[PDB]
Structures are given as C-alpha cells and as structure tokens.
Design a protein around this ligand. Structure first.
Ligand code: NOS
Length: 316
C-alpha cells in the first residue's frame, strides 16, 4: 500500500535526544512529505541483527536503514542475500554491495571546531585541561577525539585533553558519574559524544552550575542548547557538534523512492555540506570566539588544514 522505510537500531531508544532521534526524525520527515510510511525496530542484542534486517527485507520495504557500526557485519551479509533490497548504513562503511549506500560523517572536522571553542573557554578561566567523554570507541568513533584534540591544540598546545570512555550509549547514570569525575578534577569544559549516556553528562553539568560551579558541556548530534537550561534563563551547553544524520536519512530515502538510489557508494557528509559543525546561533559563544571558529572552518574546507583521523595518543 505504501513505499515504506524501516529503521533498525542497536539502541532501545529513538528519543535519545541525539543520534537515533536525528535518524528517526529524518526518516519521519521523508515519509510525511512524500505520503509514505515508516517504522523502526530495536535490536538490543546482536542475535537480533540478522533476523531484524531479514524480516524487513522479506516485507519488500522501499529502504532498510541500519544505524551504526554494530550492525555492519549483519548488513554486509544480508545485503548479499537480498540483492534486490536497498539498504542504507549510517555511521559505517560497506564495500562490494551495489544495493547498499554508506553514509559517513566528517565528524573529526566538526569536532575541531568545538575543540577551538573549548580551549578558548578554558583559557578564559585559566584552565589547562578540558574533558572529553565518549560512548564507545569502535568504528568511526575515534574521529571525534582526533578532531577535538586538534582544535584544542590549534588554540594552545599546552592544554591537555582528559578522556573517559563509557563503553555504552544508553546509560545516563554512567554519563553522570564520568562527568562528576572530570569536574571534580578541576576541568571546566567537557565535550560529550555519548548518545543517550550523554544526557547524564548534561544533567551533571546543570546540577553543578545550579550550585555555583562555573562548568560547561559541549553537546553532540542535535543542537542541545535547550537541554542544558538550569535556572530558567541560562544554559550550561557552550555549543554542540551538530551531525545531520537526519538530512542523510531523509535525502537517501528520497533517492530510493525516486529511483536514483546511489547503490554501492559511500557518501561523505562534511563541513562544506554543513552536515557537521556548530549551530548557526550560539548564545554562549562571543562574536570574537565565533570569528576564530569560522576562520578555522574555512581553512579546513579549503584543505589548507587537514584534520587527523586519530589522536596523538592513538598514533604510532
Ligand atoms: O545508539 C547508538 N548506536 C550506535 N552509535 C551511536 C548510538 N548513539 C550514539 N552513537 C554514536 O555516538 C555519536 C555521539 O552521540 C553519534 O553521532 C553516533 O556516531
């Protein structure tokens, strides 16, 4: 009865205020605007990955969307079994499948920009360390730390980045504990790249500011400024590393619907497509800080500066 897009995620939550929420929102917009339909399913454990993709393929969906590095192995296999079914992989790469499109993001380039903002706010308070909390480090996740460190060092090579890994994208309690550990050490800015877990990092920052501690958090995926309002007016969110997975999902769903699915291609959504970067409006960033950030953004887009894909501590 309708062209249908089906989303399979490893997360039990599409309202994570971040990544899964952006993907579902993009699929939802495509459906609403094109008189089509959509649905999703959660694959909590990997024993569910293959059967979940298979069921959708068995219903002859217009497009099957798989989110994240965890589902890659299952997509690689399943796409070969259903050569006529179109699949879209977000946040990972699949090769040798003419029925699969891989959407990847230049998140190292966008993270460079919030690294500049972080280093400037830290210097403002005489701090020589900033924090970074990441959900997991598999797949393309290391790009966030690589770019964040690069942006911080571009401002002041002496500022250290202190890293904490949660090893989960769905545990806010853990996010809060790791944020408390970093803030208790004297850090005043933390960039969180942790999906649902990250909501706990934002909560901890809100609680600290409420009681007079001059701390900040940088959000991810969505513009999380409102998520950080703690006293009715002010927000603890300095800025956010926005990642338009919604645009990717919506646009590729439309290509599938129209017959122009770019099967077998990896499409990079980067800083020049405005697919990653910071929000257009930033109440907590001064015009001077904004100028510095846009200056760097221009050099990255022109390739005058190339942002690494792995941080110093992860390189030989
Ligand atoms: O549930 C998830 N499954 C896989 N990856 C995720 C999930 N949530 C978040 N990310 C990854 O972490 C980054 C920051 O939130 C997201 O951009 C995405 O790359």
């Amino acid at each position: 009865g309708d062209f249908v897009v089906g989303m399979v995620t490893d997360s039990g939550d599409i309202d994570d205020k971040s990544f899964n929420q952006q993907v579902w929102e993009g699929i939802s917009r495509f459906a609403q605007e094109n008189n089509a339909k959509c649905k999703y399913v959660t694959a909590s454990t990997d024993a569910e990955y293959v059967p979940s993709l298979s069921a959708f393929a068995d219903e002859n969906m217009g497009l099957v969307v798989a989110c994240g590095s965890f589902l890659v192995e299952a997509v690689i296999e399943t796409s070969a079994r259903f050569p006529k079914q179109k699949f879209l992989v977000i946040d990972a790469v699949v090769q040798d499948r003419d029925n699969v499109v891989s959407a990847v993001f230049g998140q190292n380039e966008g993270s460079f920009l919030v690294g500049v903002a972080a280093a400037l706010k830290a210097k403002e308070a005489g701090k020589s360390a900033v924090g970074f909390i990441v959900g997991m480090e598999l797949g393309m996740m290391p790009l966030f730390e690589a770019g964040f460190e690069a942006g911080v060092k571009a401002v002041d090579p002496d500022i250290q980045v202190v890293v904490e890994v949660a090893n989960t994208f769905s545990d806010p309690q853990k996010g809060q504990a790791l944020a408390a550990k970093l803030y208790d050490s004297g850090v005043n800015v933390i960039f969180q790249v942790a999906g649902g877990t990250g909501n706990g990092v934002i909560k901890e920052a809100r609680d600290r500011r409420l009681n007079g501690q001059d701390v900040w958090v940088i959000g991810v995926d969505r513009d999380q400024y409102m998520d950080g309002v703690y006293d009715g007016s002010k927000s603890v969110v300095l800025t956010s590393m926005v990642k338009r997975a919604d645009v990717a999902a919506e646009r590729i769903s439309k290509m599938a619907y129209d017959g122009s699915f770019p099967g077998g291609q990896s499409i990079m959504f980067g800083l020049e497509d405005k697919a990653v970067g910071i929000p257009e409006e930033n109440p907590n960033l001064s015009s001077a800080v904004m100028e510095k950030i846009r200056s760097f953004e221009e050099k990255i887009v022109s390739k005058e500066i190339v942002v690494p894909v792995r941080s110093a501590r992860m390189m030989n």
